[PDB]
Write a protein that binds this ligand. Structure first.
Ligand SMILES: C=C1/C(=C\C=C2/CCC[C@]3(C)[C@@H]([C@H](C)/C=C4\CC[C@](CC)(C(=O)OC)C4=O)CC[C@@H]23)C[C@@H](O)[C@H](OCCCO)[C@@H]1O
Length: 254
């Protein structure tokens, strides 16, 4: 069986555009981080009460996510098809995918050496303990780390990694999308590119199964999203929380 058709002219171009959007929107040197509000790591050895009293890492991480949303918006805008949607649908998709794409894209800094996101330094190394000092609990953090490892062990080529993010953003089943049929047309073009790319480029491959595993990651992302969203909502009850955020974070996760 096992047909392995060549990438079409168009699929090739779609992949080139995606790699190029990603290279322009993902700086692997983390050179902008010194501009974020500074990481503050005060001893939290415990403790929800202290956590919430301090939120010591929230300004730095909020700026990091905020900056990251901005990069995601730009990335989305260079997805072939994205511009063809109404601006209303573009935004519905951006807001409901943003934290998910952040979790995907963050995989590039995540490292299995010590199960951190290493954006350089030790100032810009983020661990479980740093994410609890932003107010999150282990109900989100532990599956997030599991997802990050799960995803590292797919050993995605960068083509797959950027198609996956593109497919994540352009989902016809998001609440409040007006032209589900268009969005789906676009996702299918993107999915067919990924299915085709995998069959072409991936060794062995009796393990065409990578596609199933990639698709399952998108489903893990919905659970992480809803969990992050529960926790964000509880955090926004913390008086002065909003100082610690940014207007964009407030709109997107609000
Ligand atoms: C964000 C990125 C990076 C690390 C991501 C991380 C590490 C820190 C905690 C985060 C952010 C999680 C955490 C559960 C989510 C949080 C914590 C606090 C924040 C603030 C809004 C929150 O809600 O707290 C209440 C939030 O959503 C979700 C993803 C986590 C570095 C780099 O690879 C990229 O960045 C590199 C730029 C290159 O383009 C990428 O874009």
């Amino acid at each position: 069986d096992s047909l392995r058709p060549k990438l079409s002219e168009e699929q090739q171009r779609i992949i080139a555009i995606l790699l190029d959007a990603h290279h322009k929107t993902y700086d692997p040197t983390y050179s902008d981080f010194c501009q974020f509000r500074p990481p503050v790591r005060v001893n939290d050895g415990g403790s929800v009460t202290l956590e919430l009293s301090q939120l010591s890492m929230l300004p730095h991480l909020a700026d990091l996510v905020s900056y990251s949303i901005q990069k995601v918006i730009g990335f989305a805008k260079m997805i072939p098809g994205f511009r063809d949607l109404t601006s209303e649908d573009q935004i519905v998709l951006l807001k409901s995918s943003a934290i998910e794409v952040i979790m995907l894209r963050s995989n590039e800094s995540f490292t299995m050496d010590d199960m951190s996101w290493t954006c350089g330094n030790q100032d810009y190394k983020y661990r479980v303990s740093d994410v609890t000092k932003a107010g999150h609990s282990l109900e989100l953090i532990e599956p997030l780390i599991k997802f990050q490892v799960g995803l590292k062990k797919l050993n995605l080529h960068e083509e797959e990694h950027v198609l996956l993010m593109a497919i994540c953003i352009v989902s016809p089943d998001r609440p409040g999308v007006q032209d589900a049929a268009l969005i789906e047309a676009i996702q299918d073009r993107l999915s067919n590119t990924l299915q085709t790319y995998i069959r072409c480029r991936h060794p062995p491959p009796g393990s065409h199964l990578l596609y199933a595993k990639m698709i399952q990651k998108l489903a893990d992302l919905r659970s992480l999203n809803e969990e992050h969203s529960k926790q964000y909502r509880c955090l926004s009850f913390q008086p002065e929380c909003s100082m610690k955020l940014t207007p964009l974070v407030l709109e997107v996760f609000g």
